[PDB]
Ligand binder design. Sequence first.
Ligand SMILES: [Cu+2]
Ligand SMILES: [Cu+2]
Ligand SMILES: [Cu+2]
Ligand SMILES: [Cu+2]
Ligand code: NA
Ligand code: NA
Ligand code: NA
Ligand code: NA
Ligand code: NA
Ligand code: NA
Ligand code: NA
Ligand code: NA
Ligand code: NA
Ligand code: NA
Ligand code: NA
Ligand code: NA
Ligand code: NA
Ligand code: NA
Ligand code: NA
Ligand SMILES: [Zn+2]
Ligand SMILES: [Zn+2]
Ligand SMILES: [Zn+2]
Ligand SMILES: [Zn+2]
Ligand SMILES: [Zn+2]
Ligand SMILES: [Zn+2]
Ligand SMILES: [Zn+2]
Ligand SMILES: [Zn+2]
Lengths: 154, 157, 155, 157, 154, 154, 154, 154
Amino acid sequence: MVKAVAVVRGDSKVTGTVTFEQESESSPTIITWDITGHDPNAKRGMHIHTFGDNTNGCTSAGPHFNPHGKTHGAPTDENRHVGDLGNIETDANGNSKGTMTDHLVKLIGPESVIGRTVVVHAGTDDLGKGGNEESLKTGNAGPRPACGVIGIAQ
Amino acid sequence: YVEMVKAVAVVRGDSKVTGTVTFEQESESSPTIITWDITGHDPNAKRGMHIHTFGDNTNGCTSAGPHFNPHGKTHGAPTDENRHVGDLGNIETDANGNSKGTMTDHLVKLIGPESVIGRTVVVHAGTDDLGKGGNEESLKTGNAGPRPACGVIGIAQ
Amino acid sequence: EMVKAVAVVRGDSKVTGTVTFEQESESSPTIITWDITGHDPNAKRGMHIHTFGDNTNGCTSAGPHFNPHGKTHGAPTDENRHVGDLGNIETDANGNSKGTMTDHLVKLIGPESVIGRTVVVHAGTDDLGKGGNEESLKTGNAGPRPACGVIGIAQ
Amino acid sequence: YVEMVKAVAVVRGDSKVTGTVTFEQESESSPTIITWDITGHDPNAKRGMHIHTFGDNTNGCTSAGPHFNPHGKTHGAPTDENRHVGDLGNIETDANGNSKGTMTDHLVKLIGPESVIGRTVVVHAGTDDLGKGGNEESLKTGNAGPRPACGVIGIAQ
Amino acid sequence: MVKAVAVVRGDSKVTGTVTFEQESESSPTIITWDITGHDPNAKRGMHIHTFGDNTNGCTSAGPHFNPHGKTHGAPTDENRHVGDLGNIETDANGNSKGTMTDHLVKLIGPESVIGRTVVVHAGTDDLGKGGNEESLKTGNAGPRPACGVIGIAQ
Amino acid sequence: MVKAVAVVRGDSKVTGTVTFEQESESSPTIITWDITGHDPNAKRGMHIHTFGDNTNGCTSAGPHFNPHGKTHGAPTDENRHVGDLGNIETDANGNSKGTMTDHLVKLIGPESVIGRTVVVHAGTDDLGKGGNEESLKTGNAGPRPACGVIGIAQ
Amino acid sequence: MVKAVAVVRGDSKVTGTVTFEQESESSPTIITWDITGHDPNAKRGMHIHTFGDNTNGCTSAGPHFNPHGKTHGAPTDENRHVGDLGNIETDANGNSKGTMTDHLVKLIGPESVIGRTVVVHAGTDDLGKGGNEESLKTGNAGPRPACGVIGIAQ
Amino acid sequence: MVKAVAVVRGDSKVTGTVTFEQESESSPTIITWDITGHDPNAKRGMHIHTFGDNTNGCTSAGPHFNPHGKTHGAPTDENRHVGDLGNIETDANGNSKGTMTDHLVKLIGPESVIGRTVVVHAGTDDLGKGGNEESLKTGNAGPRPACGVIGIAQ
Ligand SMILES: [Cu+2]
Ligand SMILES: [Cu+2]
Ligand SMILES: [Cu+2]
Ligand SMILES: [Cu+2]
Ligand code: NA
Ligand code: NA
Ligand code: NA
Ligand code: NA
Ligand code: NA
Ligand code: NA
Ligand code: NA
Ligand code: NA
Ligand code: NA
Ligand code: NA
Ligand code: NA
Ligand code: NA
Ligand code: NA
Ligand code: NA
Ligand code: NA
Ligand SMILES: [Zn+2]
Ligand SMILES: [Zn+2]
Ligand SMILES: [Zn+2]
Ligand SMILES: [Zn+2]
Ligand SMILES: [Zn+2]
Ligand SMILES: [Zn+2]
Ligand SMILES: [Zn+2]
Ligand SMILES: [Zn+2]
């Protein structure tokens, strides 16, 4: 029913598209990514950050979207940010195509991620198991080579 | 909980036109204040600026689709009753190709079912004829020409 | 070919007069001449061809602007106009208006013929579809219909 | 050239509900007169009848899509200002499950850009709550239930 | 980018869908059909009839749609009805799928076929070369096993 | 079988005709109005009032015809007066032409409205949903610019 | 646990007190009102508006408190604003005493109404059933004779 | 950096403030209005009139400020009076809050509007497109329910 898309780019060669589909507010959101230009054979963090603000590049996206005030985790963790989409897997060409079904992310209602930002990170998300404050906030997934605002799609 | 919403579109595309268009709305019942700060356009020009329906940049600014038009009107001036929500008229560029301005709009909302959050600001290459051009295109797009820059309206802090 | 028509307009008003039409062939422009009296002085007044040559209820039964191409209301020179959109006539200090113009959409010959339809002289100014409201794109906000006449075949 | 338009939807579907819904409009400025002659429905019942956006029957009455809503309103009663064009309320069936009636509607048009020619009449399985149900579904569909019969609104002689 | 579709059926086993796409009023209309249940290895007339009226089955569709007042012909003829889509070719299974680009049929404007009827006929259209009055009216294409009103598609 | 008509006029420029047709006592009554001279782009109450008494203008029509002792409602409401015909819609010229099928109004039998009064009101009928006692009586539809007695038409 | 109170007044003779108690965040909030000086024998809307801002009288309270982004409805509706508390009933003297719980209004947690405003309106809330756009925003309950900021009570 | 303000009032309940700020003579002037007490849901003309003279109420403000000798127009028009600020939009409560960027109005230099008058009109400005002499002079925006002299604000 509701469809959204982020076209990500940044101060890097990482580009691509992240789409979102959600039938109703209570339904899972299906998230597809199609990323190119990343490091090969890598695990790279991908998160929804709070602000769809690109005024100062991907930095103004702010932190991970966390309406429920949880610690950073894996998508499979109960204690995760809404925006915690884990690591995407890049192939030998630095590309990553994938789909996930997310049970926290909404396109509908007060916690909608429409208008927020998808960030593809430079590093691996430690999924909140890094044992430091930074892990519980960001997963230590490194800088932000590409981001894009989640917009309404046809 | 905060009712106030701030949003920003950072616009760019296949051109030198860049800049930011900010939106602030205090409540669903209030007008939205729009501020633009555009650079790199033609000098001394009137250039159409509109909210287009889709925040989809997969095919560049073309995939933003048409003007945001939830109320099913024809294209018009911002002051017209018969206008698209997305019809913000023209911005004025100075001798350097820059445009800074601010205005409220009474149809553009950040809050509620007609929210433009996640939709697209397009800065056009030409002048919006404000639906007064006398042809069908005028009542669709204002004949404002192509889309040198666009950006998705995203939530700001 | 060489078709001539005339509407003698009157109504619930002092506005009266004659509007003549001539058309050489179906594709030719129709030459329109009006000679109107009894209107407001120094005024711009809409003059349109409305769809029906029905005067059963005064000028109201003439219906809307003649619009066989399914367009919105506009100026005569607009692409996006009704066939019946003849714009405004100008009245002089005495409330009189004489003028002539051709129109490239109005036909007396063929399927879109206006013979048997109605000329309406309106009470107000046609905004030529530029008024910025929905009514502008229907009627031009030209107001009521002080005079009308069915377009009839002339000798 | 004739301005008058007559149209008819001949409705059927995965049910015993059949019949005809005719539309007549004298001019773009006039209301449209709607006449229905429905058979095979539940007896002594109120049943929603709406114009849905698409005249697409490729997957049965589901392909007609939602209520025709060019003006971007929520679902309502025909007499409501805030209604879909397609909101024709309920028809009444008699003791035999038949419904014959006629009314004009002031939003449904056969002429002009909001023409319903080529769209779909759906006769619903349940009662239209006229947008007064207090839930989001009421403001979308009137909670009128599934679509036992539909037909494309076609031009009549 | 107007799209239309007719779903055809009638007092026969002939069913299927006929779609129409037209970019603008002056652009050609692309027509696609997907018909099943017809005679095998046959040429079968397919026309747009004037009325989208199914009150009396396919008979109520009236004659071929002919706003320009021409005689019946092949789609390639200058002198044809707007509704003259010629013959479709059915395969060994009685099925016919095809696409044509039609330079007269419109979905936009006063001659729009939206709300009119596609009829699939029982016989072969003689394309107005039958030499009788009926040929110049109907192509002698026989009865009307299936029809459907051309409706607006998403 | 029975046809009736009311020609409405009063202390105003509102005039017009309201016609009634009923095949049999249990059949719905079809009501058609053709009203001119009202406010433009407005919703205006129209009701059948009990008395076809115009001795003191539209006031002596008395209240809404309510043989079944209901509260004031919309025509669609189960709780409505027989005379509750709801709002008519006026166009940009203050004209209203419409037709409705009414399942309570009768021209035949003991609850016949023949000889009663159609009133066209000056304001909008709140349909019994105004939340005060007057709403449940009159719909708060304002004064009575025009009325006419429902007379036998054939 | 948490108790709160609004003392309402404004550009009118309407005054009074609206108290709130909530045992836990998920518990219903118990609301009691004791209002004086209103119209007699009337239904009058009473709502929690978003802002506890009285800088420009009751207008500064803004719209109905609507953190879930719904339309205006009755308290019992699924589709309602958090602040939609419907109508209070005034007696023959213009007074209204009553108590009810509400299942959406909270004093505890992120949707707390503490520091927001109770508005007693001049007219009747149509509960979102008015059939116009304003009904789905305000209930058409009219102006704001009294309001008060919801403050922590002992 | 000049700031100005007009506090408008008159023979009406229309009141409010109109502020002006301009960085330099060639810069646009930002104009903000906060108007209350007007007709609801309306378009109302707002203009700068030549004279900051209130000796005869808003009438002594004279005509639209027109130092460049143009016809009356919309703010967006080449052919407009300096004082032509077009229509403001009032909400359901008759309030209008807005901001505009005006490319002709100056607070600095010989065409300064400091000491001139903001008038809020009773009717809609036809923006010079009413087709009569008055339209090209005043926009036919009607009488002057409120006005105020533009005064230096810092
Ligand atoms: Cu991140
Ligand atoms: Cu045929
Ligand atoms: Cu009454
Ligand atoms: Cu003025
Ligand atoms: Na998951
Ligand atoms: Na949500
Ligand atoms: Na990181
Ligand atoms: Na911003
Ligand atoms: Na707004
Ligand atoms: Na919001
Ligand atoms: Na006369
Ligand atoms: Na008309
Ligand atoms: Na029909
Ligand atoms: Na109905
Ligand atoms: Na052949
Ligand atoms: Na009728
Ligand atoms: Na009824
Ligand atoms: Na809640
Ligand atoms: Na005063
Ligand atoms: Zn996180
Ligand atoms: Zn537009
Ligand atoms: Zn016209
Ligand atoms: Zn609906
Ligand atoms: Zn043919
Ligand atoms: Zn009643
Ligand atoms: Zn509410
Ligand atoms: Zn002026």
